[PDB]
Amino acid sequence: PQITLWKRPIVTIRIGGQLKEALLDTGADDTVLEEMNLPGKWKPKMIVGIGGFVKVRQYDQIPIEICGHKAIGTVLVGPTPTNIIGRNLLTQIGCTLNF
């Protein structure tokens, strides 16, 4: 579908049977979810936001359903005020910006 920008481009996501909302964020390199126990091994990572760096945990090959579209990839988990879907997964669902 086409998603307009008058309000925040937030969509339903599904991950491990969890139902959540998330931002479709063309400015995020990476996908950052609020805190949750994901399976598998995680590595610590420092990522940049507008206010500075935060420490997060990187899990790989995590499947996630975005707006009825299957995606599988790297997911970062840390102290974010919002679930954020980044370019790494946005490309997988064929998302473009148009103007």
Ligand X SMILES: CC(C)(C)NC(=O)[C@@H]1C[C@@H]2CCCC[C@@H]2CN1C[C@@H](O)[C@H](Cc1ccccc1)NC(=O)[C@H](CC(N)=O)NC(=O)c1ccc2ccccc2n1
Q: Where does this chain bind ligand X (CB under 6 A)? A: 23, 25, 27-30, 32, 47-50, 80-82, 84, 86
Contact between 87 and 26 (Cβ < 8 Å): yes
30 is catalytic: no
Verify binding: residue 4, a second copy, rule CB under 8 A.
yes
Query: Which amino acid makes up residue 24?
Result: L
Question: Sign of torsion, CA 52 26 12 62?
Answer: negative
Q: Which phi and psi angles does 93 have, rounded to 5°? A: -105, 10
Query: Which amino acid makes up residue 33?
Result: L
Closest approach, Cβ 8 to ligand X, in A, equals: 7
Closest approach, Cβ 47 to ligand X, in A, equals: 4
Report the interface residues with a second copy, using CB under 8 A: 1-6, 8-9, 23-29, 32, 47-54, 67, 69, 80-81, 84, 87, 90-91, 93-99
